[PDB]
């Protein structure tokens, strides 16, 4: 039951990080050229380029 | 509410391993 509930907590973060940070509703309009989005980066170590 | 990244990522980057390692080091070295 512990490994089974990791799987549903894993699959829920696929739904939540797409609903909140991805472009699913913008991907419906043209799936052949709109390029999907998994999640967003918050990396402090990034430079501006 | 994209400001939650500024408060969850440093906690999981810094606070979560510091709280975990300081628990486990005192637990494995415990007579």
């Amino acid at each position: 039951f512990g490994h089974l509930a990791i799987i549903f907590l894993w699959a829920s973060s696929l739904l939540f990080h797409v609903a909140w940070q991805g472009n699913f509703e913008q991907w419906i309009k043209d799936p052949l050229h709109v390029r999907p989005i998994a999640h967003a980066i918050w990396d402090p170590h990034f430079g501006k380029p | 509410a994209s400001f939650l990244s500024s408060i969850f990522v440093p906690v999981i980057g810094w606070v979560v391993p510091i709280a975990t390692f300081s628990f486990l080091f005192l637990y494995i070295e415990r007579e």
Binding site: F1, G2, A5, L9, Q21 | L4
Partner: peptide, 30 residues
């Protein structure tokens, strides 16, 4: 995207498996 309100509902609901995972992982012994 989803509204700013709905993110906080997802965080509070996520404490319910977060509490139950702490109960299961300590019922399985130390």
């Amino acid at each position: 995207s989803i509204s700013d309100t709905q993110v906080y509902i997802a965080l509070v609901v996520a404490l319910i498996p977060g509490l139950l995972a702490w109960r299961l992982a300590t019922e399985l012994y130390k």
